[PDB]
Amino acid sequence: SHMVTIVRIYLDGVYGIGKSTTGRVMASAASPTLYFPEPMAYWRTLFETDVISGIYDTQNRKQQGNLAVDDAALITAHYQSRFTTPYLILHDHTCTLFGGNSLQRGTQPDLTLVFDRHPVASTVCFPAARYLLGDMSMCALMAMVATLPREPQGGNIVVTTLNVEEHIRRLRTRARIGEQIDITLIATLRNVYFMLVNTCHFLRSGRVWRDGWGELPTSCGAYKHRATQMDAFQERVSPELGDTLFALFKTQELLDDRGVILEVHAWALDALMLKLRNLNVFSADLSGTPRQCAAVVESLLPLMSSTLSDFDSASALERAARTFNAEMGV
Amino acid sequence: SHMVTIVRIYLDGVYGIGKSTTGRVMASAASGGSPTLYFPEPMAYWRTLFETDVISGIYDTQNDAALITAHYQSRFTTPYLILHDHTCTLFGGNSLQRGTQPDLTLVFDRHPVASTVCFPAARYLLGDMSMCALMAMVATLPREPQGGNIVVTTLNVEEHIRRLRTRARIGEQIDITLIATLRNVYFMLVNTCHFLRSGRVWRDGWGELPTSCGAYKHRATQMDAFQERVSPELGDTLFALFKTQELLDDRGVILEVHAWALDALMLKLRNLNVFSADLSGTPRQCAAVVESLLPLMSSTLSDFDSASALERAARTFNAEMGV
Numbered sequence: 024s025h026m027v028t029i030v031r032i033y034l035d036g037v038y039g040i041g042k043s044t045t046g047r048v049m050a051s052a053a054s055p056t057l058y059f060p061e062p063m064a065y066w067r068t069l070f071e072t073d074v075i076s077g078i079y080d081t082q083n084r085k086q087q088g089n090l091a092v093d094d095a096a097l098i099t100a101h102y103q104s105r106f107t108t109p110y111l112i113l114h115d116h117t118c119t120l121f122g123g124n125s126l127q128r129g130t131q132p133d134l135t136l137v138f139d140r141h142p143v144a145s146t147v148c149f150p151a152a153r154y155l156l157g158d159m160s161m162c163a164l165m166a167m168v169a170t171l172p173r174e175p176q177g178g179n180i181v182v183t184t185l186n187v188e189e190h191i192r193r194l195r196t197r198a199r200i201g202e203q204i205d206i207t208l209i210a211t212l213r214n215v216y217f218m219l220v221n222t223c224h225f226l227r228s229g230r231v232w233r234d235g236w237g238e239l240p241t242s243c244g245a246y247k248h249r250a251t252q253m254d255a256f257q258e259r260v261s262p263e264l265g266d267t268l269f270a271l272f273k274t275q276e277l278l279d280d281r282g283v284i285l286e287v288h289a290w291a292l293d294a295l296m297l298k299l300r301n302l303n304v305f306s307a308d309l310s311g312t313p314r315q316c317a318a319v320v321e322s323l324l325p326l327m328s329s330t331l332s333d334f335d336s337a338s339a340l341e342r343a344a345r346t347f348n349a350e351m352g353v
Numbered sequence: 354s355h356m357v358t359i360v361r362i363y364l365d366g367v368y369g370i371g372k373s374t375t376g377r378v379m380a381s382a383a384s385g386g387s388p389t390l391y392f393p394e395p396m397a398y399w400r401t402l403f404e405t406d407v408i409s410g411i412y413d414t415q416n417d418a419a420l421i422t423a424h425y426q427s428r429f430t431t432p433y434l435i436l437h438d439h440t441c442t443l444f445g446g447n448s449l450q451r452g453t454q455p456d457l458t459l460v461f462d463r464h465p466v467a468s469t470v471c472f473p474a475a476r477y478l479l480g481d482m483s484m485c486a487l488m489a490m491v492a493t494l495p496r497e498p499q500g501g502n503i504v505v506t507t508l509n510v511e512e513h514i515r516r517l518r519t520r521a522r523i524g525e526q527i528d529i530t531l532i533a534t535l536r537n538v539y540f541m542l543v544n545t546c547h548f549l550r551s552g553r554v555w556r557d558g559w560g561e562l563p564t565s566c567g568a569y570k571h572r573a574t575q576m577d578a579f580q581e582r583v584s585p586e587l588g589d590t591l592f593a594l595f596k597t598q599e600l601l602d603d604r605g606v607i608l609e610v611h612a613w614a615l616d617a618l619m620l621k622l623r624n625l626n627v628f629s630a631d632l633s634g635t636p637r638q639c640a641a642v643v644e645s646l647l648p649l650m651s652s653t654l655s656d657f658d659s660a661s662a663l664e665r666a667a668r669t670f671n672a673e674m675g676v
């Protein structure tokens with residue numbers, strides 16, 4: 024007759040921190056929780072091109088002078104678009120199923136979903152990092168950001184954190200895929216994920232991207248340099264506009280002669296703001312063992328938004344996790 | 354707060370037929386009928402706002418290529434996604450076919466389906482883009498909220514190419530092969546919507562359908578090969594091109610992840626009340642043909658503040674997207 028209480032979590036963050044490991048443990052019968060893995064097979068094997076080696080190979084052939092730059096920036100953008108696809112497909116498939124009545128009930132849910140990354144990772148975070156590093160243009164970044172899907176009510180995002188030394192240790196330990204392992208990339212990603220956390224805190228504080236936009240300095244070469252510096256950003260209690268994702272958009276490329284952002288670009292920021300609204304944000308330190316890491320995330324559950332879904336939707340969710348694990352190489 | 358009834362129309366179709374001219378006439382007070390707001394093609398976004406001109410860029414690419422082409426097609430979609438995100442908060446709900454004249458009409462020059470689906474599909478069919486690239490684009494189609502109407506422009510190909518010629522320099526070539534394919538693709542679009550409106554789903558006839566290989570792609574680029582169907586079958590729709598080996602397992606069964614992509618496409622198109630409109634008349638007559646469809650179109654219930662925001666949006670988009 025009645026409803027299933029669901030809490031959904033997107034575990035997200037810089038690669039190499041331990042998010043996937045944590046997610047599998049949480050889902051393990053050793054501790055009812057479903058886990059949706061990174062869509063590895065979609066990225067690597069389902070098509071003729073592997074996007075992870077492709078994106079690194081592009082910067083390699085950029086360095087070796089075989090790729091004219093210019094073209095590299097365009098190809099880099101295209102590989103980055105391909106990362107998003109399976110996230111967009113999964114989000115489209117699951118978003119009808121969670122149900123409504125988002126509330127912080129403080130109870131154990133009937134069903135917990137753990138998604139490995141939210142779409143914001145491939146549409147915003149990784150693209151923003153590539154932009155800040157000079158691997159991609161603002162135009163290419165806009166193109167990715169515009170494809171972010173709106174999160175419906177009840178979303179929770181848990182951004183993983185880890186001290187730099189242990190992060191480097193762990194990056195050393197991942198299997199060889201042909202992935203780009205670059206400490207400037209890592210530094211930048213780490214800063215961008217703090218910007219994300221800060222954006223969410225900024226919005227929940229009742230502010231909007233125009234609040235402090237005037238007084239904000241133009242974000243040019245100097246801004247980009249600082250965003251690539253290890254530990255230049257951190258999670259803030261009350262963030263400033265300058266601590267969020269919005270700040271990197273106050274660049275000359277996006278303003279008229281008189282210094283004023285075009286309305287069409289302002290719309291792009293309004294959209295970004297609205298799409299993040301339903302993400303209840305948390306951070307989790309992963310310095311512990313896998314078991315302690317999962318416990319850290321689990322201790323957040325009673326703080327999270329739950330929705331009310333019906334039996335048939337919850338069943339479709341179980342089938343979705345089963346299918347996705349199977350087809351993605353779990 | 355005071356209630357306002359809106360009909361919105363995405364006028365769409367192959368470039369060169371007369372869509373933009375028609376929409377400008379509709380917006381003009383001289384066409385009478387309903388007070389109409391027109392949203393043009395995002396020309397400046399494509400051509401002048403950034404360093405790279407994507408129109409020149411995509412055509413120059415064909416003159417690694419497959420990846421650059423996919424990225425240019427991505428950039429076409431951007432301003433459409435932004436505009437759709439902005440305006441969808443203003444249309445309101447309570448979609449119905451009311452039969453009566455709305456308080457105002459919106460005319461959008463193209464729907465997001467053009468840049469995320471139709472043009473990518475044409476490029477894929479011509480071997481200029483991979484299926485993987487096509488999926489990437491299709492996945493970014495936004496869901497149409499209740500009350501959308503789409504009008505696909507049609508025109509005999511002879512007059513279509515004539516229109517492109519008048520406008521073209523005095524020795525400038527026309528990509529006849531691309532235009533031939535896009536005309537078929539837009540018929541597939543029309544057929545897809547008719548197909549969905551009849552309560553059918555992409556799975557209907559999927560098994561019986563031949564895999565869409567070399568022969569399918571030949572037919573798809575063939576001038577006049579497709580048309581608007583009274584009663585479309587699956588093979589007349591956009592769904593058919595997706596039954597390809599690239600998307601199937603060993604047993605020739607579509608992977609569930611790809612099936613989900615097709616479900617999403619199907620749902621995203623649901624709220625598009627579909628029409629076609631012949632544009633062989635003068636611009637005044639073309640505007641009248643499109644406007645005569647209003648009694649059959651969905652309208653929504655918005656309000657004065659949101660309608661006012663739509664007028665500002667139209668004013669702004671027209672200004673910022675110009676030359």
Ligand SMILES: Nc1ncnc2c1ncn2[C@@H]1O[C@H](COP(=O)(O)OP(=O)(O)O)[C@@H](O)[C@H]1O
Binds near residue numbers: 039041042
């Ligand atoms: N809690 C942990 N303690 C020690 N090593 C870990 C821990 N979590 C993950 N690792 C190791 O670090 C590497 C990256 O972990 P992974 O789960 O792939 O990170 P992510 O999913 O964040 O990219 C793997 O080699 C993994 O075995």
Ligand SMILES: Nc1ncnc2c1ncn2[C@@H]1O[C@H](COP(=O)(O)OP(=O)(O)O)[C@@H](O)[C@H]1O
Binds near residue numbers: 369375636
């Ligand atoms: N109704 C019409 N009759 C004759 N020529 C037309 C008509 N409508 C448009 N044209 C011309 O045809 C060309 C294509 O028109 P345009 O409105 O740009 O088409 P589209 O928006 O479909 O790409 C233009 O040169 C235009 O002046």
Ligand SMILES: Cc1cn([C@H]2C[C@H](O)[C@@H](CO)O2)c(=O)[nH]c1=O
Binds near residue numbers: 061078140145150202
């Ligand atoms: C999600 C995502 C991952 N990656 C990279 C980081 C890792 O090397 C690998 C798996 O996350 O793919 C991107 O380059 N872009 C993305 O959008």
Ligand SMILES: Cc1cn([C@H]2C[C@H](O)[C@@H](CO)O2)c(=O)[nH]c1=O
Binds near residue numbers: 430463468469472473
């Ligand atoms: C909307 C759209 C237009 N075009 C081209 C066709 C015309 O030459 C020009 C303007 O519509 O841009 C694309 O290549 N892709 C697209 O997605």
